[model samples]
Target chain A: GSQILCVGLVVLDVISLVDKYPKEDSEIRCLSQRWQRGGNASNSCTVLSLLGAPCAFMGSMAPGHVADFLVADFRRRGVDVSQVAWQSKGDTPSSCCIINNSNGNRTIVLHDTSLPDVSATDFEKVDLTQFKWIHIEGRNASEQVKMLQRIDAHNTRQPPEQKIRVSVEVEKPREELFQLFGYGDVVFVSKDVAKHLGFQSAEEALRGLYGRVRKGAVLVCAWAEEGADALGPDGKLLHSDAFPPPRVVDTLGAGDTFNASVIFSLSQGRSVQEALRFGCQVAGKKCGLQGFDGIV
Target chain B: GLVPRGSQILCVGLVVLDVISLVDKYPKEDSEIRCLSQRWQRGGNASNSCTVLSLLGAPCAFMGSMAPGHVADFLVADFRRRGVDVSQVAWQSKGDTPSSCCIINNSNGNRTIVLHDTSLPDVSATDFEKVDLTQFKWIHIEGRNASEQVKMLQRIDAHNTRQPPEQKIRVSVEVEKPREELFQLFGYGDVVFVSKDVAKHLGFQSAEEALRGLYGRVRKGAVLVCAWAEEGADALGPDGKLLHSDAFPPPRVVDTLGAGDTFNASVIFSLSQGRSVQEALRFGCQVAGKKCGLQGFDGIV
Candidate 1:
């Protein structure tokens, strides 16, 4: 299987399954409790690993008990954690999550005090040549900038067949979002970010980035249950609605699974639309299962 | 008004209100479910001890924070019904009372806890001075707020000096920490109880060594008591003599959560009843054993 390197935030999620959300000055009973490793990049890497893709996850984890939990969780999933670094000084980053049954939606109360701020130095330490694809989430913009710069410089030095393909998953827009366009061979954005960028429609959002987006890179936008759209360099726009399964247990981490599936299919030399369809099928199957990595 | 204030015992520490969910077992990840039972109760290490003591017919006074809220009212009513004195507790404005959740899995009496509280200032030193230490025959202090406890100990020492020479109060300190504070407390305390776990935290190879190390720094009048959950009670007297109580028959433990506090209260109650140190250790061991057999601390005799 081909390998994909994913880099972003890593969080220890302490979740309590509650009957309902507590009203003002009232309390609700927690029916269950579970702990898990959660984050955009972390979940993506986990899903890819579950789908028989070799995945390497790189992010900052605090040293000690908290890092131990994250490292153990990744190892259990059979994902490569060699690129992950532990930050010793900060409290392990964690989030307190309350999962409500009514909608399978979670209300997160995050308490991340000691998240390590990534830098150019962190990017320089990774051996990017080993992976077929570099999956980047736009979390730490400065670090992302440095990573993109290194990949772009490396690609320029390699033969066409040896150059690495890069994908940028834009969950949130920062001031540095525009700078990332030229660095990635593919750009993925959620509808939430599309709306934030002042585009009334997903197509309009992709159209707005035409001149600014790299000439050969593909642009994809996920619209939750509504579907996803992809615009290829040949000016072909592809749209596909989600083929959702019957039961929707938990919608959380579905998007990350979709991204991983799409990357996996594309790396297998499938057509862009076929990859999108495969990604949607995986996401649809995910809704019937319990958690993000349950599709396998 | 009919009860003599000096005859009762005073227990001071954090008193938190708890909301608990009773369940057969903890649920797995991503599974939505409901609890079997839900309950709200007054809970805290110090509060549990005093409540148990009050139930045992020893008049008790609780000194701690009880801010405004239904939770605060819940604590006040629960303790008062158990015949505890709540007059010295401070009520802070503009903040909800501290509350916590206890998830009790029926398979085992073990529970997972989640605490929620508003950060508030410690009780003032002046408040400690105003407390009528002479009125209470015994005082039990929990090692929660260290600075406030140190200040309170100083006030207690000063109060002890003002009492008649023949009526000197016996001070028993619960050494919860293995740090320097435990040794610092020895200068003002008459009797000190150290848990086996806490002794290990202090870098002692054995309970005997921990007691010896403590005795080396404390005043000659201080007595060191050590508790071992399975091994029973051991005591070292002020004159450097060692004493041990034969292991009390163990009870089937329902919840071992409040055993230490029950032991502390029973020790004080027995000592006040004119029992010897050896007799008091046996009494404490029995009380703790009975407490562990019950569902809550109040079930202890």
Candidate 2:
């Protein structure tokens, strides 16, 4: 079985549901609330795992009572957490989120203060060559760079059939992050991050980074409900127009879910344009449901 | 004590994502039928506390997990619109949303719940520090994770010790226990409440006796209280004196989800106004009565 490997923060989430956004001083009633496991890498891995992909989650989770919920949650979803390094000193990372129904959007208050710093040393024990696809969330910038470099070095010595496909989910476009494109086979970026990089459009952003990225690697840029665009190996631009489903309940994890779906499809030998469509379909399914991991 | 008008109460507890259905009557055994009304709402012990407090004219704030997604956004906007402070609450990382569930037979205000709460993340001690405890005069904490709650209590105790006499905050705990921890928590609370069912679970014969036994082992500043559904409330003072109140008139039965939280809020509200223990019990019962009459926890006037 080809394994989909994901790396990033693992956090607990406290969620509340309301009819609409609240005015500055006025109060609105919450219709429902819940607590659950969350994280960008965790979410993507969970989606891939649910879709019958052999998935493994690589990250740091605080040990003891705090990590108990996340550890148990991932196990239930069939994602291998054996690679997770459980730390005991720091608090488990967490997020508090409020979801509004009107536009199916959420305003999040995040707490990453307790997130343990990731390092290349953390991946030294893992067999990176076994993975069919490696997805990295730009969490610890410098550490991810080092880890990717190590993977690239390992791939160089391996047989052509055994070389691992690498993907990067550029959540924030920091200046240092541009280096990742040199090593990654597929680069995924949200429109917000693209805008931050001073690009007028997703196509423009991918074109701007074209020179920095490895030859033949795919460049994917996601715009909220506007679909995504991809730069193919042949220098052709592929567009996957967004067709959001009606009745959006919450869109918090829609993008990540899309990323997972796209990655999963591509791992199955689907074309980049087809993979982007699959990703859009998955995100549309998410909007129709209530939460991010609304797989059921 | 110059408490600001909009100064709020901070409530910490578990929030459960609920999918609800309203029916004409309770379901019969081995038979399946469609519901008359169906709706989904977010709920839980701590959220119930904040909801009722917000409805009762107190600005409120909630501290807990809400993972990223539509469900989480729904909850956040709910609290914010209700005048609850949400700035300090945190968001969960991508792909992770909070627990969710379905509620059946919601007619006559009763519900049967089927919950999917797996993989929910636990709140850490560091997350507790983000809360500006000094801004609120009262803190109501629900016993979710034993270790986390204990740490929170210790932090609150430490914070209380550093404040000026008049500026010190009061702490109250809602005991949802597994016997061992319930007994352990008695020593840490200033006001501790156990339900009639919980008293039975702890092997106590009556609410009065339970309160007395709890008060005996608790810290000097702690008060032990027990709540009854149709009977009333019983409490023990620091001097080991017993205090009791008759049940206030029951409101029209709606959803009883937040009745206990209303009791907690009312008791604290009354006590803050210098009311005696007996008076506080009466106020709490009245608040609970109003809570029982509503469709949701925050429907109290």
What TM-score, over all chains together, does every model reach?
0.54, 0.54
* Stretches > 4 Å off in candidate 2: A292-296, B1-301
Report the C-alpha lDDT of model 2 over B1-301, residue by residue, as the tens digit. Answer: 3447326677777765555545555443212234454444667777877776777777777877767665677677767666667665656673344554333433444434333334556566788877667677777777767677788889988987887877777777877655566556666767887777778876787887788656666778687888786777888877777888877655457667767777887887777666888899988988887777776764467
Residue A208 CA displacement from its true place in model 2, Å? 2.1
Model 2 residue B161 CA deviation (Å) reads 43
Cα lDDT tens digits for candidate 2, A187-222: 887776788878988889888877777778898988
Retained true contacts (fraction), each candidate: 0.00, 0.00
**Native-interface RMSD of candidate 1:** 13.5
Candidate 1 per-residue lDDT over residues A122-169, each given as its tens digit: 879888778888898887776688888898898899988887888988
Docking band of candidate 2 = incorrect
Per-residue CA lDDT of model 1 for B1-301, tens digit only, reads: 5457477777777787665666666654333234566555787767887887887788888887766644576688888888888888976764546666666667875566555544544456667777766568888776656666778887777777888855655666776766665556665567777777788887876667778876765667777888777677778887677877755544565777778788888887888788888898899888888877788865576
Listed per model in order, the count of residue pairs whose N, CA or C atoms clash below 3 Å is 1, 47
